[PDB]
Design a protein around this nucleic acid. Structure first.
Ligand SMILES: [Mn+2]
Length: 745
DNA sequence: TGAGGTAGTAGGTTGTA
DNA sequence: ATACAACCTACTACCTCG
């Protein structure tokens, strides 16, 4: 066996309680509230004074060294108050801020390859290291001949205990930017209209996209009224723009939509946002090179943070403070509790299934109401490839005969399907306007002889002729007719190949067509812990001013889906009204009632989303309905990656390994081997209840093993995950009865 | 959209100290 | 009576799957 760890570093030696210098601030300016301008006075006095540390207490300000009272600042008149040795047990936070400042100050000076400063730093938790680590432990730059720069963005976040030992929390991430800019684009003469950009010289909310390039000169009076060069002279940014040569002032104005008004800027002032789209559009070979760099297994992350922490060395302003290089031998010494969950025993038609894959030799758990008829929209120039593809998937689904060869790996009649090419209908479509796609789906609606669509779509790639997926999904959703779609690439794979890649494609295709007609393929044999039904919820927070409604789901102790639900009436902002909770749980109790003849006696409410709800609603509710219950909150994205240790060897964890502290616990739900990344585990936090977190983790990991639209695990469990997919697909709600036939899966 | 895993990139909002 | 750090959302790209 083996241990687990969190990526953290214990500091050798301790922090001594140092003499800190108090400073009050007062709002001379228009913002009388200093609490809304404490950061601005902080950063200005920290800036103007050799970047000596300038910290923030609840309403005051610290420096570790003596900086005089400076009152030139038009909003803040900083004055000295007292000089007291700050007790560490009073402020864990400010001594952690010291450890942060001293790692940033030790690491500013650290250069690489002689001239080159390694870590571009501005004294915060985020540390940009210019050089990288390869797999062979070489500090090398990674750039292209275009010029796209991979950079590690290290994240320190140190904390220090009551007496003075320090804990350094690290997490490494990749980062793209390019040394080029849009000025470097146009002086090279490339097209820029439509590009996502980032203004370093003015901080603007919303996401920026390039509208156009005016041929008008940047050195003339503007529609703002004065020249933009005077606009940045009044920005006091003259140390950058004074570097402008005659060709620099020869440049042209480039405007960019900023969701409120276009911004009249110069191309030098903008970098393009380097989404990985922009990489593959601008250097594919580089992207294929760095994909082994950005996805990181744990040995590589340990080498990366080992380089980082050796670049700390020893810091001496904290009295010869140094951090170790290794991780922990156990998280017990940090305060979490480890373990790995038993993998759930899973059952199918003939009882227990051994692999998740041989269900197609075992047959499905439950089949829906009888007989279903297929139907395919196809491109009129992609006919025979499509016909061989449908013949492959239907001979799989009915005959079990893999590209014309029967195998004992496939069982007959695994759906009770009805398809016959002399009987059925394939309406065709031309790859064209979306209104043709819509009227084609209507024409396949006008014959009431199809019971299930398998449409064919153009690809997720291919910016050419318009993608047919979403208008089909809208029009087939409003019919409440499920539709497992297939790309033309997938059609070519089924038509060309005879090999088992088409079998993998076909596995996921058939589990999709099952889970959309409401059949459920496999379920757990026995749920650990005594629970009747699960309840998902989530609310999406999409853009500025977006307040979504909670879409539930309800499973059983077998975990098979029973009902999901969309509320009646609108909520109070994003804070959901209590009667929507009432309405949902009314549908929950009647759903489990008329599906199993009894009220639920244990309800696990896996919630994503914030506690805009109130627990005492649930307390009064399930006290009057006198049934115990459990609200485990699942938070989907967490930065705390987890590593395994086998005698110093740092590997990615096997799935189902967890770490736990009280009422928060982390756990990986997916097996990723080497070469592919570090598993980004789950965040689970029991807001209420009377069950041990061990059993809630066991139920969550089993509900990641019952994803029913794949042969592999969903990272989220099917409660929160299917709640999330429904909340993305809020246009795909049921017309009438809100029952089953998962449109998302 | 196989399909969902990691991975980035922007971006908004609170929950807890 | 207000923080800031996690969450969470949106789109892609890579890459594997008896
Ligand atoms: Mn699907």
């Amino acid at each position: 066996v083996s241990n687990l760890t969190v990526e953290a570093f214990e500091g050798i030696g301790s922090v001594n309680p140092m003499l800190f210098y108090q400073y009050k601030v007062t709002g001379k300016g228009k913002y009388d509230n200093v609490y809304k301008i404490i950061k601005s006075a902080r950063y200005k006095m920290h800036s103007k004074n050799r970047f000596k540390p300038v910290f923030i207490k609840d309403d005051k300000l610290y420096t570790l060294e003596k900086l005089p009272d400076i009152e030139d600042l038009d909003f803040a008149n900083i004055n000295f108050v007292k000089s007291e040795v700050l007790s560490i047990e009073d402020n864990m936070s400010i001594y952690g801020e010291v450890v942060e400042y001293y790692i940033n100050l030790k690491l500013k000076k650290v250069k690489v390859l002689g001239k080159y400063p390694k870590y571009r730093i501005n004294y915060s938790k985020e540390i940009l290291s210019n050089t990288l680590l390869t797999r062979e432990l070489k500090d090398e730059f990674k750039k292209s001949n275009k010029g796209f720069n991979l950079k590690r963005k290290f994240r320190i976040s140190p904390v220090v205990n009551k007496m003075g030992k320090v804990i350094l929390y690290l997490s490494c991430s990749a980062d793209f930017s390019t040394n080029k800019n849009i000025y470097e684009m146009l002086k090279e003469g490339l097209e820029v209209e439509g590009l996502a950009v980032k203004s370093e010289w003015s901080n603007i909310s919303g996401n920026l996209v390039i509208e156009s390039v005016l041929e008008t000169k940047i050195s003339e009076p503007t529609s703002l009224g004065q020249s933009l060069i005077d606009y940045y002279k009044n920005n006091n940014q003259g140390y950058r723009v004074k570097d402008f040569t005659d060709e620099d002032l020869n440049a042209n104005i480039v405007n960019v939509r900023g969701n409120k008004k276009i911004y009249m800027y110069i191309p030098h002032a903008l970098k393009p946002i380097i989404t990985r789209e922009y990489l593959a559009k601008n250097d594919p070979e580089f992207s294929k090179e760095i994909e082994q760099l950005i996805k990181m297994n744990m040995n590589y992350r340990y080498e990366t943070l080992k380089s980082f922490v050796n670049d700390i060395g020893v810091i001496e302003e904290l009295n010869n403070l140094s951090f170790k290089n290794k991780y922990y031998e156990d998280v017990k010494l940090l305060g979490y509790s480890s373990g790995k969950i038993d993998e759930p025993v899973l059952m199918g038609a003939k009882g227990i299934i051994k692999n998740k894959m041989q269900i197609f030799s075992n047959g499905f758990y439950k089949l829906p109401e009888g007989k279903v008829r297929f139907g395919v929209l196809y491109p009129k120039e992609f006919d025979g490839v499509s016909r061989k593809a449908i013949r492959a998937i239907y001979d799989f689904s009915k005959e079990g005969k893999y590209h014309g060869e029967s195998n004992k790996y496939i069982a007959e009649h695994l759906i009770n399907v009805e398809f016959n090419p002399k009987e059925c209908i394939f309406e065709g479509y031309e790859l064209g306007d979306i209104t043709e796609y819509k009227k084609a789906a209507l024409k396949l609606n006008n014959y009431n002889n199809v019971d299930f669509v398998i449409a064919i779509v153009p690809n997720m790639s291919d910016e050419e002729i318009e993608n047919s997926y979403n208008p089909f999904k809208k029009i087939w959703a409003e019919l409440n007719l499920p539709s497992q779609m297939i790309s033309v690439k997938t059609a070519e794979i089924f038509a060309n190949s005879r090999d088992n890649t088409a079998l993998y494609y076909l596995h996921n295709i058939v589990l999709g067509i099952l889970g959309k007609i409401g059949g459920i393929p496999w379920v757990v044999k026995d749920m650990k812990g005594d629970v009747d039904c699960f309840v998902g919820l989530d609310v999406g927070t999409r853009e500025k001013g977006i307040h979504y409604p909670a879409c539930s789901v309800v499973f059983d102790k077998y975990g098979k889906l029973i009902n999901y639900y969309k509320p009646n009436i609108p909520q109070n902002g994003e804070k959901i009204n209590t009667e929507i909770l009432q309405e949902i749980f009314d549908k929950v109790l009647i759903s489990y009632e008329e599906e199993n003849g009894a009220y639920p006696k244990n309800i696990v409410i896996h919630r994503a989303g914030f506690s805009r709800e109130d627990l005492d609603w649930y307390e009064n509710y399930f006290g009057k309905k006198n049934i115990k219950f459990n609200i485990i909150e699942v938070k989907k994205s967490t930065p705390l990656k987890i590593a395994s240790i086998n005698e110093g060897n740092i590997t990615n964890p096997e799935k189902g390994s967890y770490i736990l502290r009280g009422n928060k616990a982390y756990m990986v739900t997916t097996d990723i081997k080497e070469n592919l990344g570090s598993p980004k585990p789950l965040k689970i936090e029991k807001s209420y209840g009377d069950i041990d977190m061990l059993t809630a983790l066991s139920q969550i990991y089993a509900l990641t093993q019952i994803h029913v639209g794949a042969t592999k695990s969903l990272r989220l469990p099917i409660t929160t995950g299917y709640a999330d997919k429904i909340c993305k697909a809020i246009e795909f709600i049921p017309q009438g009865r809100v029952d089953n036939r998962l449109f998302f899966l």
